[PDB]
Design a protein around this ligand. Structure first.
Ligand SMILES: Nc1ncnc2c1ncn2[C@@H]1O[C@H](COP(=O)(O)OP(=O)(O)O)[C@@H](O)[C@H]1O
Ligand SMILES: [Mg+2]
Lengths: 526, 77, 58
């Protein structure tokens, strides 16, 4: 250390031997923390908070865990950031990306101990990932021409995604709900059109998807409670003292009877607007704002249903289901399109009462009712079902799939191995380490179940080298099998994102050799 | 056993008598606090709806199956 | 059988801690069950006093 000081008090510097030490300790720390939640037989963690008023949640997702953990190592924050982005991109594989990105760094520290310059490893890995992604592409199978065959693939993808979650207790029941829900969107990737309503009580198997729609609102007082063959007008306008006349006007009169005259003119304005609404020949009215008690009785005298305070989400969803138009100014009744549902009634679920729409016109949106025993099950069920809906929506956008259960990893690990046997130099060593990292992912799945991982992986390595490119693990019995027969299937887009993102982070971390920290701010709260 | 304990009886003796009497015939036999022993229950006009027993059992097993999936505890913010 | 050594004991400990903690609650309210069970008094930190036999309220 130079005798002269260059840093202010509290600032610290770390260099080559210490910098690479700290960065590797952090990465493997986060990788080993989440390995327990991987595969069809991983277990779940408990997150309890000291700051957020002792909030408690039970989860298996690898991205939810990494968001709540308060990491402070600079290198560990890079790993958390990729997992959050991956969740917002395809919605699955958050656990696989971080484990793989951590296993690459575990092999990278051993190579440095053998006196190989870091730039040599990166150039070596860059060739390894190119040959790995190309081999994956040649493994893709693309359906979509046959509805019957494509329908089978959607059931296989949804069945695999739900395996590692709590929904595996009822996988058959929950596979049908997830698939049929996505077929309603008619190819539009608006996932917000699916409203998952979760309310406590009853068994987890009582959950279902409603054939129509459900609204958790309340109708006006002294209005019909149920209508057959309804015509719906969807509006976004003011009705509680709509007289917000944008100007800065004011009333200046010299008597009292003038005020009582102007006051009566206010009600005439509201009454006239109501008549123009009823001119459309509607029998159901939906508004996104409040409804005052004076216009409430106008509908109550005319025999109409008025729903109030259905926010932007509640209105846009109704537009897709019934096909109406969100209208305002009510001046041209011919140009506005109304909705149509066969029946509207009030239903009771648990304790609450919700509005039931049945026999809708379009049905391009839906609602899902979830039941359960604890708030932890309801949250876990909803979060698990989010993974299934997203990955299915990506499949419809790009309908090419790749086999899973370790069949995919072993194929790419072999393609890099063949390349490393022709390349001279120290780059050959680095490429082999890439194959050691990919093959760990099938190993970790076997370890969690209590099987001889070394024996099973050894059989897979031989099977894939001799041309049986569909071999892979079978969890229910701990032997080998064919995926074309069993049906374990992933998405090409999901696996591609897992491979490319993971290989990048081990590149950005590995190029770092100096760590510098500014003197932290002190806690002096308000 | 818990009901036979709160009433000041011998829990081992009562449950042994109960399991004996349910395995050779009647199924309505139960604890009788007023008499202090075991007798036919429907003669005492004590009943309860079926949904209470079914729902209690179903919610219990669903929770226990959820507990066994837990493996680790960590502290967050 | 011959191998598959389990080198991590934390899962085995956390499960046994959950068994003990969950069992403790059931032994706490075991008394309030039955036609001859008794009640409880709960004094909040504010000062409120409740006397109850309901199991969800306790
Ligand atoms: N029935 C099954 N048989 C074999 N492998 C499976 C099965 N179900 C899931 N898997 C595998 O489990 C792996 C991990 O997926 P998952 O547990 O959801 O974590 P991630 O968050 O990485 O998706 C996937 O690679 C998938 O191939
Ligand atoms: Mg998954």
């Amino acid at each position: 250390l130079a005798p002269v000081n260059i840093f202010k008090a509290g600032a610290d510097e770390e260099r080559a031997e210490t910098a690479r030490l700290t960065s590797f300790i952090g990465a493997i720390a986060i990788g080993d923390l989440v390995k327990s939640t991987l595969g069809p037989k991983g277990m779940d963690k408990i997150l309890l908070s000291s700051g957020r008023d002792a909030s408690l949640m039970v989860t298996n997702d690898g991205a939810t865990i990494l968001k709540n953990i308060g990491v402070d190592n600079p290198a560990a924050k890079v790993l958390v950031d990729m997992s959050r982005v991956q969740d917002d991109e395809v919605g699955d594989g958050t656990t696989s990306v971080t484990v793989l990105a951590a296993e690459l760094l575990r092999e990278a520290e051993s190579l440095i101990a053998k006196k190989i310059h870091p730039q040599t490893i990166i150039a070596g890995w860059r060739e390894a990932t190119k040959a790995a992604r190309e081999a994956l592409l040649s493994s893709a199978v693309d359906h979509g021409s046959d509805e019957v065959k494509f329908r089978q693939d959607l059931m296989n993808i949804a069945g695999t995604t739900l395996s590692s979650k709590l929904l595996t207790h009822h996988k058959d029941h929950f596979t049908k709900l997830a698939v049929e829900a996505v077929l309603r969107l008619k190819g539009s990737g608006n996932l917000e059109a699916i409203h998952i309503i979760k309310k406590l009580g009853g068994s987890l198997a009582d959950s279902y998807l409603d054939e129509g729609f459900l609204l958790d609102k309340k109708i006006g007082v002294n209005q019909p409670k149920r209508i057959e063959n309804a015509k719906i007008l969807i509006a976004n306008t003011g009705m509680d003292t709509d007289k917000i006349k944008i100007f800065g006007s004011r009333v200046r009169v010299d008597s009292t009877a003038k005020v009582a005259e102007i006051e009566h003119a206010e009600k005439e304005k509201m009454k006239e607007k109501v008549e123009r609404i009823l001119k459309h020949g509607i029998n159901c009215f939906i508004n996104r704002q409040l409804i005052y008690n004076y216009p409430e009785q106008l509908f109550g005298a005319a025999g109409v249903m008025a729903i109030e305070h259905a926010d932007f989400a509640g209105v846009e969803r109704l537009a897709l289901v019934t096909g109406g138009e969100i209208a305002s100014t009510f001046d041209h009744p011919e140009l506005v399109k109304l909705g149509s549902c066969k029946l509207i009634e009030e239903v009771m679920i648990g304790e609450d009462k919700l509005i039931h729409f049945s026999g809708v016109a379009l049905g391009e949106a839906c609602t899902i009712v979830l039941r359960g025993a604890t708030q932890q099950i309801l949250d876990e069920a909803e979060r698990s079902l989010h993974d299934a809906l997203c990955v299915l929506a990506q499949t419809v956008k790009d309908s090419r799939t790749v086999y899973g259960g370790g069949c995919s990893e072993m194929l790419m690990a072999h393609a890099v191995t063949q390349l490393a046997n022709r390349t001279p130099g120290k780059e050959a060593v680095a490429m082999e380490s890439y194959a050691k990292a990919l093959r760990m992912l099938p190993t970790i799945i076997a370890d969690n179940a209590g099987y001889d991982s070394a024996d099973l992986v050894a059989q897979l390595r031989a099977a894939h080298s001799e041309g049986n490119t569909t071999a892979g693990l079978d969890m229910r019995e701990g032997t080998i099998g064919d995926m074309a027969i069993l049906g374990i299937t992933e998405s090409f887009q999901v696996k591609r994102q897992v491979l490319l993102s993971a290989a990048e982070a081990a590149e950005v971390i590995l190029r770092v050799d100096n760590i510098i920290k500014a003197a932290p701010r002190k806690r002096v709260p308000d | 056993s818990t009901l036979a304990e709160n009433a000041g009886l011998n829990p081992i003796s009562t449950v042994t008598e109960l399991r004996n009497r349910h395995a050779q015939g009647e199924k309505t036999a139960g604890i009788n606090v007023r008499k202090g022993g075991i007798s036919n229950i429907l003669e005492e006009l004590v009943v309860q709806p079926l949904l209470v027993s079914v729902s209690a059992l179903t919610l219990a097993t669903e929770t226990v199956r959820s507990i066994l999936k837990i493996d680790d505890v960590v502290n967050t913010r | 059988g011959k191998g598959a050594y389990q080198d991590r004991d934390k899962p085995a400990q956390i499960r046994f801690s959950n068994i003990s903690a969950a069992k403790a609650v059931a032994d706490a309210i075991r008394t309030s069950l039955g036609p001859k069970g008794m009640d409880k008094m709960i004094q909040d930190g504010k000062g409120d006093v409740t006397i109850t036999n309901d199991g969800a309220t306790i």
